[PDB]
């Protein structure tokens, strides 16, 4: 059938995607969230982050 169904995706934007929306493009790697920048404002509370600065 096929032995050509992938080529190395082991670093850079091809490697990684958001644990919620499955998108690329603007995710937060800090502290190991791995979460899209829009998706994080959505759950920023249930994790425990509170805005008080």
């Amino acid at each position: 059938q096929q032995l050509y169904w992938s080529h190395p995706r082991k670093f850079g934007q091809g490697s990684r995607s958001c644990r919620v929306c499955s998108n690329r493009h603007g995710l937060i790697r800090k502290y190991g969230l791995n979460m899209c920048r829009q998706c994080f404002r959505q759950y920023a509370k249930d994790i425990g982050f509170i805005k008080l600065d």
């Binding site: 992938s6 644990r19 919620v20 499955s22």
Partner: protein, 98 residues
């Protein structure tokens, strides 16, 4: 082929033994984890459960990249037929819950 008959039966028996299935939405990972892990790619698990759901037999949910599949009564019967079991055996779920 859609998958080997060996693979089908291995997936169905696991689903019946427990009564509920789970897989992440990903077609590339080479083995399903869990008790299919010695043999089966999770592409087969997804593709199998899809057919099973289109015939009743199963309820499907999806939340953050992960399917959750429950076996319903019609599923109990069909699987009990398809696997030739003692026509009254179910280790899936049997205890009165307080």
């Amino acid at each position: 082929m859609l998958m080997p008959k060996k693979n089908r039966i291995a997936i169905y028996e696991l689903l019946f033994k427990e009564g509920v299935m789970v897989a992440k939405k990903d077609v590339h990972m080479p083995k399903h984890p869990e008790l299919a892990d010695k043999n089966v790619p999770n592409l087969h698990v997804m593709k199998a459960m899809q057919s099973l759901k289109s015939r009743g037999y199963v309820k499907e949910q999806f939340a953050w990249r992960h399917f959750y599949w429950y076996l319903t009564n019609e599923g109990i019967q069909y699987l009990r037929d398809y696997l030739h079991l003692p026509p009254e055996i179910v280790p899936a779920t049997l205890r009165r819950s307080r």
